[PDB]
């Protein structure tokens, strides 16, 4: 083998229902992943397309 070991992650990339998704979990029952990135895309400058 060219290499004997690979460089991988050490822990699970966690995801918790934080303060913005708790309101829609308790209120609607629809959580999204990375609510802060939806807010960064359509609230804070929606004119900047990714």
């Amino acid at each position: 083998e060219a290499d004997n070991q690979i460089m991988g992650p050490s822990s699970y990339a966690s995801f918790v229902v934080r303060g913005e998704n708790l309101v829609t979990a308790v209120s609607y029952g629809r959580v999204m992943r990375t609510f802060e990135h939806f807010m960064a895309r359509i609230v804070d400058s929606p004119e900047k397309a990714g």
């Binding site: 229902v17 708790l22 979990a25 308790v26």
Partner: protein, 50 residues
């Protein structure tokens, strides 16, 4: 999301205990009113007896 359910679970038991102690100050007044209503001979007897 489990602390947000534990909050509702302490609200339920608190509003059941407060229901049970509201229904006893509502039952004490009912007992007082229904024991005033048993030692109350009517007007057409006490207007002559007194």
């Amino acid at each position: 999301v489990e602390y947000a359910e534990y909050v509702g679970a302490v609200k339920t038991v608190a509003s059941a205990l407060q229901f049970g102690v509201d229904a006893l100050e509502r039952g004490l007044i009912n007992t007082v009113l229904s024991v005033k209503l048993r030692h109350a001979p009517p007007m057409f007897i006490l207007q002559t007896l007194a």
